[PDB]
Amino acid sequence: YSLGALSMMGFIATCFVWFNNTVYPSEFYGPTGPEASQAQAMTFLIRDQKLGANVGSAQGPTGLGKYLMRSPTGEIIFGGETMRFWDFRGPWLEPLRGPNGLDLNKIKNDIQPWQERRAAEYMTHAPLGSLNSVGGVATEINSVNFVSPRSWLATSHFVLAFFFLVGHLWHAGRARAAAAGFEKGIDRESEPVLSMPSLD
Amino acid sequence: ANLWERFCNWVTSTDNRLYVGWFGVIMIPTLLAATICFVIAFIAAPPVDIDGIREPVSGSLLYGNNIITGAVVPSSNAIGLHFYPIWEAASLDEWLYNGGPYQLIIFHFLLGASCYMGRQWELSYRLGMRPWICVAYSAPLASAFAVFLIYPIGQGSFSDGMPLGISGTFNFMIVFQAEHNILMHPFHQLGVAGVFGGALFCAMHGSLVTSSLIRETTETESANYGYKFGQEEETYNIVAAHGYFGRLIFQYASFNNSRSLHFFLAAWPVVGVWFTALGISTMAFNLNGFNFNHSVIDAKGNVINTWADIINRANLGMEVMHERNAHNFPLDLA
Amino acid sequence: AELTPEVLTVPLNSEGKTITLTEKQYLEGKRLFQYACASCHVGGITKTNPSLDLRTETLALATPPRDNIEGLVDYMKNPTTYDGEQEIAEVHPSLRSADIFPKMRNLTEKDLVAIAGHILVEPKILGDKWGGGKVYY
Amino acid sequence: MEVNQLGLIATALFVLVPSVFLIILYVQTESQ
Amino acid sequence: MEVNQLGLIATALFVLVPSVFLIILYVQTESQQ
Amino acid sequence: METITYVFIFACIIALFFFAIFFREPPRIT
Amino acid sequence: ELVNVVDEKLGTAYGEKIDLNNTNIAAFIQYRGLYPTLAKLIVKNAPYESVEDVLNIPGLTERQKQILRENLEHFTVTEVETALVEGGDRYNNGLYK
Amino acid sequence: QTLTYDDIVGTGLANKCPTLDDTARGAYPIDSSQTYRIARLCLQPTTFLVKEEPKNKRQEAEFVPTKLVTRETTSLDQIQGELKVNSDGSLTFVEEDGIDFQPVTVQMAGGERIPLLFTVKNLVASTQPNVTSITTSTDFKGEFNVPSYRTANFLDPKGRGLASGYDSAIALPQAKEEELARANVKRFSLTKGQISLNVAKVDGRTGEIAGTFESEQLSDDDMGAHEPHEVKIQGVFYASIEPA
Amino acid sequence: VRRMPAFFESFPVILTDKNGVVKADIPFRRAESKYSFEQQGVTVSFYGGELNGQTFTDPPTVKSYARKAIFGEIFEFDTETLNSDGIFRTSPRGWFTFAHA
Amino acid sequence: LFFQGFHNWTLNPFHMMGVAGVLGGALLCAIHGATVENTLFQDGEGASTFRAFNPTQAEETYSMVTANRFWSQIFGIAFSNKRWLHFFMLFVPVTGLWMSAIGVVGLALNLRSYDFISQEIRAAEDPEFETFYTKNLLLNEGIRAWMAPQDQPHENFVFPEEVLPRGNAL
Ligand code: CLA
Ligand code: CLA
Ligand SMILES: CC(C)=CCC/C(C)=C/CC/C(C)=C/CC/C(C)=C/CC/C(C)=C/CC/C(C)=C/CC/C(C)=C/CC/C(C)=C/CC/C(C)=C/CC1=CC(=O)C(C)=C(C)C1=O
Ligand SMILES: CCCCCCCCCCCCCCCC(=O)OC[C@H](CO[C@@H]1O[C@H](CS(=O)(=O)O)[C@@H](O)[C@H](O)[C@H]1O)OC(=O)CCCCCCCCCCCCCCC
Ligand code: HEC
Ligand SMILES: CC1=C(/C=C/C(C)=C/C=C/C(C)=C/C=C/C=C(C)/C=C/C=C(C)/C=C/C2=C(C)CCCC2(C)C)C(C)(C)CCC1
Ligand code: OEY
Ligand SMILES: [Cl-]
Ligand SMILES: [Cl-]
Ligand SMILES: [Fe+2]
């Protein structure tokens, strides 16, 4: 029963550390995966906007906005692949939020340098890295010695939660068997199937 | 007795041709729904905008696929991890466009298969068997959870779960190597040892038991008729198979306890596939394969390439082409 | 091939004066570039603005010029845009901005020059790879 | 789709010929 | 000649299905006696 | 015709399952 | 009757020089002093009839007008090509390293 | 009221334009010696109509209703621009910027999917002359640009494109290229649309107006690979006018 | 024209000079292309055979002869008679070897 | 990865069969081991069941009859014949590797199952037609061009940046 409990808890722990940036502050743990991905869209919105791009009307190649598009319930959200992560919420990003989602006037006017810094920091500390701690995507060259605490903690506790479910099945099944008295095997002298009618 | 007891007794009857059981009560409806939807979608479903960019992929036979290219396509990236039941769509037409059948199939299937495992425990209890077959099955089940649930969770979208198709499976494997260098991950190398070794030990055990069948038939009938179902005795000479195999290698590299030998056959593939399921599950959180890119350099500092650098050039070819219209910014962070 | 004093000889200033570095300095400047810079500049690119790299030919055409140690050291004290028209210490690590980029706090002036020489030496070794990006991995 | 229309007859005989073989052997088995 | 493509499959089945049926009944007849 | 061929083969297999389960040679203890 | 408008442009002066009406803003990095400040102005004020209209941009400074003069030999103008200027592609054209 | 993001998120209201009370039937006086601007313009389509292909015999095409499949991603908003007073008295809105395009896919009977770039890029919309106040009978008519639905970097499934991509069908190395040219050679279309905006609600006090619109434009041609359809879009709009 | 090696179902069009310096190519990304036929003004002239004495200068024509040059010498083909599909097949040397091995 | 990018080996039915045989052999290995271990007769009185087996005993150490019923009711069919079962264990993996060998002999000659002509005819004509088969080829194309220069250095492949196939941004 406790291996049951523990396994379920380990899985929950795994998602806590992966998604939650409140009791696992990104200041201390690095950015979440959603967070880094959102941060990159912000970084390049910022850069291109400084060059003179109108980021609200920039139609990307697909016909969807290059920087901004709508979520399926219509909220203004960052564009590109990060469209999956629009549920992200973090203190560096919420000031640009209006009632309908990201607010283009706040985007045009109100981005402070501390947000450009955090977004750049977080994009370059995305929780991607190799088992031997080369940081980045799998095609990256050696140089950066980094794997996110969030990856370390989520992977370890997935593995641990999984094996503890296996332990649950092992010991629950065995407990049942042992309580009924056939954990050591079948009794040749009273083999239960031999007293059952044939299936056909 | 009373009605609920007649029912309980039927559900758990060891006399039904197929055991139902309490796990069966959930398994049957969920697998039926998953199977009917999958068969209909595979044949008839229209194209699905998998990556959320209004670039629909045709997966079904009626829209120009064959058995090898067809698939039920994962749900839209625009959806990410949102729950997308039929009733959340404004119309079946919208649900088909955004890949809803995929969510329906895999949720009902993970449920159904999780209960299939419980059913294996359940019947072994009603039969007075030992209980751990279901443990063996946890290895394949764990693997399905990884490609259909865990990997989408880490990456934030069901659009990156495994497609339900022959070629779609290949797509998923190539993108995976590009993004996680899975070949260079020890858990995947443990998976390959698992299945290679399982195939090996499978051929070995079969070859070795077949090699030592007791002459109980003539040359004109199948050897198999020398075994009668339920016979008290054994139909091969395990001592002779040890005598052969012990000499093939050496006497103690060979098993002479039938129970130790069969436990080994169970444990080798199960453990290895546990590891490779955990490999997908941890690469889901971007703890990737070993990275040895430009690891050897010479006295001046020139990069001296290894085979790891040659792999990396293939990976890069996968990286820059996959989902060719889907990235606007230079890093592909999930 | 080996790490020779000729490889380790780089412009000290726009004057064409030069300085020669030791194996030890170059490697210091590699450890330190890794510690403070590679997060964004791995292999000579700039992840947060790929348009600008650390190729010497790029540094050369920057204003002020930066294909030499002093101008690089200056950049790490008081960074500017490529045309020199704006200062950017608010968003780029620098001794000026060590309060907000804490990694720069404990960099001695000899640390900066090591970083500058590593930057200037590396493309002589790697050539195209440096600042070239994934095409050359 | 512009498929090979000899594929249909290839597939059909791929199935029919060996299946018939099996059926024939099975049925004459059951009748002795 | 510009001939009906399905004529081929039609002819093959037309021969094969009825013929196979007769052989099945013949062989299982011989195996009785 | 190709779609029909794939679906027909798939449907014969499903029928094969039915007969192989419910109309098997019953295993008997001889 | 059907041609790739972009390949055809490679055969014009766009293929040799910075086309002030078309080229992506990252190409101004090639010459000293143009990026980012003046490139932003050239592009914002884009469609020019002649390269030398660039010297008339409101508010240039005297050092800027001189930098432009030093680099008129690197500029050209060709007719605006819709496929090159839509989508905000003059600011970001999908090419990084 | 003053709602917050957390109030709206996931409800579908972020795709809705604001509205005005049934009691806003005032007029916004227009001071010819003043300069004006649209501070926010919101368009929210409610119906998408596609012209059917009248077979060779024809007689007359109709505009057939269609089913939307791309969800609450359709509205144009945060659009800004100056409201000029012309000297014949009319008003002219000149779009500057905003979220002025949405890709939309609707479905026709039979299952044909029709993508389009619903848009008012470069909208220029004028009133009738001698307009001294904006009222609940004030109309604007305008035209906008409709750029290609995909832009130039977009690659088709065989890797072909305009600004990138293969220039031939590389899987058929020795096919005659001539039958394939229309698909090998990508073309970027730019066409024009037309829109009427009929003012029906006016809060003279705040400068908010609201009404219905109808626009006509083409759908996607898939960078020249096939002929586009005519689309008629209908919906509602909201706008705030501030003095400049 | 750099010729197609047999390993490759597809192959880019790269032209080098007598010493193997890349001088012309058909680019994939066009935005930073420095070797396109239009920039380099490559022409094709034919000697012998059907086209002997001709020269084409328009880039799209030059490009389609460049794509066939990766296959070696260029021939006219009747594709209509057998409704050929444009994809290479193997020869009886190929089939024989395959079957016997 | 060479075999993926140049031969499209995953698409090859002879490999597909070999995969079935190797993964099917691993399956057989695990399910037979587990079935035996969980149908043992009680032949000793200890909790470690390994000590209750004598290689010279005459008797089956596990119950074919209960194993059979279990799988008949779990999975619909079951083995009934011990000899057939162990012959099947030899056959499946041995036959899979043989089929894979045949396909590689094909690839010795570049006789690949690389394409589906009908998809290519459609796709070349219909720029809206896309399947997982075309997506995979685009990946193959990326592998060949990005890996060949270093992988086959004796060819002196020189690919300028501009010819390298790449999707947007990456
Ligand atoms: C090698 C074995 C191993 C190791 C080293 C760890 C290590 C860790 N685990 Mg894991 N864990 C393991 C196995 C392991 N685990 C297994 C087998 C499972 C089950 C599958 C889990 C399940 C698990 C969960 C579910 C979680 C962890 C978490 C953690 C981390 C925090 C632990 C913590 O604070 O505990 C808590 C400490 C205690 C319970 C001890 C009592 C402490 C008291 C209550 C503290 C009072 C503090 C208070 C403020 C003081 C006030 C005093 C006064 C001022 C008023 C840590 C890195 C956490 C984490 O970071 O996950 C991402 C987490 O949430 N573990
Ligand atoms: C010789 C080369 C080789 C070999 C031997 C393997 C071997 C393996 N690979 Mg690796 N791989 C390779 C090359 C190779 N790979 C290459 C080159 C790449 C890069 C392109 C990869 C990329 C890769 C990825 C990305 C993944 C693998 C995985 C795996 C495993 C697949 C088998 C499995 O998951 O079983 C586990 C069992 C199952 C998945 C089956 C579950 C069955 C469910 C519960 C029941 C289904 C019932 C069915 C629907 C109905 C039947 C009813 C019927 C009777 C009517 C195995 C360890 C996978 C893995 O580890 O998954 C965990 C994985 O995801 N590989
Ligand atoms: C048309 C639409 C809608 C359809 C959906 C399309 C869909 C995608 C389907 C496609 C299907 C597809 C194309 C299939 C491809 C499969 C493929 C590649 C074929 C391989 C062909 C082939 C001949 C390969 C050669 C190698 C080969 C011989 C492999 C054989 C593998 C195989 C059958 C292994 C056995 C698997 C298995 C489940 C075993 C069951 C055994 C079992 C009942 C054990 C229980 C048991 C254990 C005991 O220990 C004891 C004691 C007892 C008593 C007992 O009982
Ligand atoms: C200092 C460094 C750190 C040190 C760390 C130490 C780590 C070592 C861990 C030791 C674990 C103990 C062994 C495992 C338990 C065991 O003994 O089994 C119990 C049985 C009993 O054996 C049987 O034993 C019987 C006697 S009895 O049962 O023990 O009483 C006897 O009857 C029979 O003949 C005999 O075969 O073992 C056997 O059946 C023999 C086969 C052993 C199989 C190994 C275990 C499972 C393998 C999984 C690995 C898969 C690999 C993945 C492939 C990809
Ligand atoms: C990410 C936040 C960065 C870190 C960490 C470091 N640098 Fe950087 N660098 C970064 C950006 C975004 C830019 C572009 C600035 C702009 O002009 O808008 C730069 C630029 C430089 C340059 C100039 C290169 C040129 O071609 O002109 C240099 C010389 C440089 N950066 C050096 C540098 C060093 C030495 C660092 C370690 C201490 C370092 N940077 C960190 C982003 C980031
Ligand atoms: C009572 C009971 C029981 C039984 C149960 C059952 C038997 C169930 C069934 C169930 C079922 C039987 C269900 C099913 C389901 C289904 C589904 C859910 C489906 C869906 C589908 C879809 C939705 C589709 C759609 C589509 C597509 C995909 C494409 C084309 C178009 C269309 C639209 C058609 C038992 C014995 C256990 C015991 C207890 C009691
Ligand atoms: O790998 Mn590459 O990374 Ca995981 O997302 Mn970003 O691109 Mn896309 O949608 Mn499926 O795939
Ligand atoms: Cl892809
Ligand atoms: Cl992106
Ligand atoms: Fe056995």
CSV table of N, CA, C and O in Angstrom, one decimal, chain F:
chain,number,residue,atom,x,y,z
F,1,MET,N,-9.6,1.1,-55.6
F,1,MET,CA,-9.5,-0.4,-55.4
F,1,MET,C,-8.5,-0.8,-54.4
F,1,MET,O,-8.6,-1.8,-53.8
F,2,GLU,N,-7.6,0.1,-54.1
F,2,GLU,CA,-6.5,-0.2,-53.2
F,2,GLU,C,-7.1,-0.1,-51.8
F,2,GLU,O,-6.9,-1.1,-51.0
F,3,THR,N,-7.8,0.9,-51.5
F,3,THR,CA,-8.4,1.0,-50.2
F,3,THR,C,-9.3,-0.2,-49.9
F,3,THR,O,-9.2,-0.8,-48.8
F,4,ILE,N,-10.1,-0.6,-50.8
F,4,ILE,CA,-11.0,-1.8,-50.7
F,4,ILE,C,-10.1,-3.0,-50.4
F,4,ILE,O,-10.5,-3.8,-49.5
F,5,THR,N,-9.0,-3.2,-51.1
F,5,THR,CA,-8.2,-4.3,-50.9
F,5,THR,C,-7.5,-4.4,-49.5
F,5,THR,O,-7.5,-5.4,-48.8
F,6,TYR,N,-7.0,-3.2,-49.0
F,6,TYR,CA,-6.5,-3.2,-47.7
F,6,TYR,C,-7.5,-3.5,-46.6
F,6,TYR,O,-7.2,-4.3,-45.7
F,7,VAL,N,-8.7,-2.9,-46.7
F,7,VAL,CA,-9.8,-3.1,-45.7
F,7,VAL,C,-10.3,-4.5,-45.8
F,7,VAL,O,-10.6,-5.1,-44.7
F,8,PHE,N,-10.4,-5.1,-47.0
F,8,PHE,CA,-10.8,-6.5,-47.1
F,8,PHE,C,-9.9,-7.4,-46.4
F,8,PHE,O,-10.3,-8.3,-45.6
F,9,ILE,N,-8.5,-7.3,-46.6
F,9,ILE,CA,-7.6,-8.1,-45.9
F,9,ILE,C,-7.6,-8.0,-44.4
F,9,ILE,O,-7.5,-8.9,-43.6
F,10,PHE,N,-7.8,-6.7,-44.0
F,10,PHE,CA,-7.9,-6.5,-42.5
F,10,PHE,C,-9.1,-7.1,-41.9
F,10,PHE,O,-9.1,-7.6,-40.8
F,11,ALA,N,-10.2,-7.1,-42.7
F,11,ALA,CA,-11.4,-7.7,-42.2
F,11,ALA,C,-11.4,-9.2,-42.2
F,11,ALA,O,-11.9,-9.8,-41.2
F,12,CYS,N,-10.7,-9.8,-43.2
F,12,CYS,CA,-10.5,-11.3,-43.1
F,12,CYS,C,-9.7,-11.7,-41.8
F,12,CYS,O,-10.0,-12.7,-41.2
F,13,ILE,N,-8.7,-10.9,-41.4
F,13,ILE,CA,-8.0,-11.2,-40.2
F,13,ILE,C,-8.8,-11.1,-39.0
F,13,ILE,O,-8.7,-11.9,-38.1
F,14,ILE,N,-9.7,-10.2,-38.9
F,14,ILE,CA,-10.5,-10.0,-37.8
F,14,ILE,C,-11.4,-11.2,-37.6
F,14,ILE,O,-11.6,-11.8,-36.5
F,15,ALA,N,-12.0,-11.6,-38.8
F,15,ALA,CA,-12.8,-12.9,-38.8
F,15,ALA,C,-12.0,-14.1,-38.4
F,15,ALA,O,-12.4,-15.0,-37.7
F,16,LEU,N,-10.7,-14.1,-38.8
F,16,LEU,CA,-9.8,-15.2,-38.5
F,16,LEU,C,-9.7,-15.3,-36.9
F,16,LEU,O,-9.8,-16.4,-36.4
F,17,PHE,N,-9.5,-14.2,-36.3
F,17,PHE,CA,-9.5,-14.1,-34.8
F,17,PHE,C,-10.7,-14.8,-34.2
F,17,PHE,O,-10.6,-15.6,-33.3
F,18,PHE,N,-11.9,-14.4,-34.6
F,18,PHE,CA,-13.1,-15.0,-34.1
F,18,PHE,C,-13.1,-16.5,-34.1
F,18,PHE,O,-13.4,-17.1,-33.1
F,19,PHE,N,-12.8,-17.1,-35.3
F,19,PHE,CA,-12.8,-18.5,-35.4
F,19,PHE,C,-11.7,-19.2,-34.6
F,19,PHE,O,-11.9,-20.3,-34.1
F,20,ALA,N,-10.6,-18.5,-34.6
F,20,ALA,CA,-9.4,-19.1,-33.8
F,20,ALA,C,-9.6,-19.1,-32.3
F,20,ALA,O,-9.0,-19.9,-31.7
F,21,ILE,N,-10.5,-18.3,-31.8
F,21,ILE,CA,-10.7,-18.2,-30.4
F,21,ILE,C,-11.9,-19.2,-30.0
F,21,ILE,O,-11.7,-20.1,-29.3
F,22,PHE,N,-13.0,-18.9,-30.6
F,22,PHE,CA,-14.3,-19.5,-30.3
F,22,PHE,C,-14.4,-20.9,-31.0
F,22,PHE,O,-15.2,-21.7,-30.5
F,23,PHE,N,-13.8,-21.1,-32.1
F,23,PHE,CA,-13.8,-22.4,-32.8
F,23,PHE,C,-12.5,-23.1,-32.9
F,23,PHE,O,-12.1,-23.7,-34.0
F,24,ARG,N,-11.7,-23.0,-31.9
F,24,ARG,CA,-10.4,-23.6,-31.8
F,24,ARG,C,-10.6,-25.1,-31.6
F,24,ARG,O,-11.7,-25.6,-31.1
F,25,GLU,N,-9.6,-25.9,-31.9
F,25,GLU,CA,-9.6,-27.3,-31.4
F,25,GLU,C,-9.4,-27.2,-29.9
F,25,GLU,O,-8.4,-26.7,-29.4
F,26,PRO,N,-10.4,-27.6,-29.1
F,26,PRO,CA,-10.3,-27.5,-27.7
F,26,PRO,C,-9.1,-28.3,-27.1
F,26,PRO,O,-8.9,-29.4,-27.5
F,27,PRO,N,-8.3,-27.7,-26.3
F,27,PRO,CA,-7.2,-28.4,-25.7
F,27,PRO,C,-7.8,-29.4,-24.6
F,27,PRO,O,-8.6,-28.9,-23.7
F,28,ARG,N,-7.6,-30.7,-24.8
F,28,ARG,CA,-8.1,-31.7,-23.9
F,28,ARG,C,-7.0,-32.5,-23.3
F,28,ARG,O,-5.9,-32.5,-23.9
F,29,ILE,N,-7.2,-33.0,-22.2
F,29,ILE,CA,-6.2,-33.7,-21.3
F,29,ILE,C,-6.2,-35.2,-21.6
F,29,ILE,O,-6.9,-36.0,-20.9
F,30,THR,N,-5.4,-35.6,-22.6
F,30,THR,CA,-5.4,-37.0,-23.1
F,30,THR,C,-4.3,-37.8,-22.5
F,30,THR,O,-4.2,-39.0,-22.6
